[PDB]
Amino acid sequence: VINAMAPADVASIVVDEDKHTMDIAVEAGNLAQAIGRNGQNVRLASQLSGWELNVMTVDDLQAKHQAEAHAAIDTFTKYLDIDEDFATVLVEEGFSTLEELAYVPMKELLEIEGLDEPTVEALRERAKNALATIAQAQEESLGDNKPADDLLNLEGVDRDLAFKLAARGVCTLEDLAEQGIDDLADIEGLTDEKAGALIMAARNICWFGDEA
């Protein structure tokens, strides 16, 4: 990685899985020479490792670094969950939030001031259950038969709107066209004008399907 940033001054870099994407971490002052030309050293050093590099800045790294600590937390906290006053004091000492942290050391959080019977070791289990709950949410969006490609690729409807429409037994765009404004009015996410426009669009796609 560093050798591919030469001739310049590399200091650090990030990693990943298949597409690690070497995130070059240098300083603006040294970035001038490191980057050299917008379309020259950014491509020459891209094939250096064979994959691709993402030249960044020392400050940029930290900026993105924090944009990761808050998110295993910055995601509406859809994992374990209990009281919030204890959750703040737990996430203060907690490294990398709780996102799948049960596979890590399950003995250093017991050092935290307040660890009687295995409950925090249980709080992490709740996070695991939250992951299963997230899989159940996938079942709510796939685990229980989500809409077809005709209904999903319909213009004017998103994935959540397609799921809300398909939750009433419909599966295809023709099934959505068979439903009425009053039948789609049972879902509060769709309005009468929006359900009318979606039904008209599905009926137009069904009727004018012979024309491209």
């Binding site: 009425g180 426009a197 008209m200």
Partner: protein, 54 residues
Amino acid sequence: HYIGDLVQRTEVELLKTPNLGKKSLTEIKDVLASRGLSLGMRLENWPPASIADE
């Protein structure tokens, strides 16, 4: 409120609105099978000459 207003508008114009349903289309076809309504006519507003005000 009157079926004359339904005869004043085209069936294509009614099919371009999702207020009518799939079973409502079959009911409209059953009503138009008698050819008394939805025959693609055009009125002045309401009244024909036989429908005169007296």
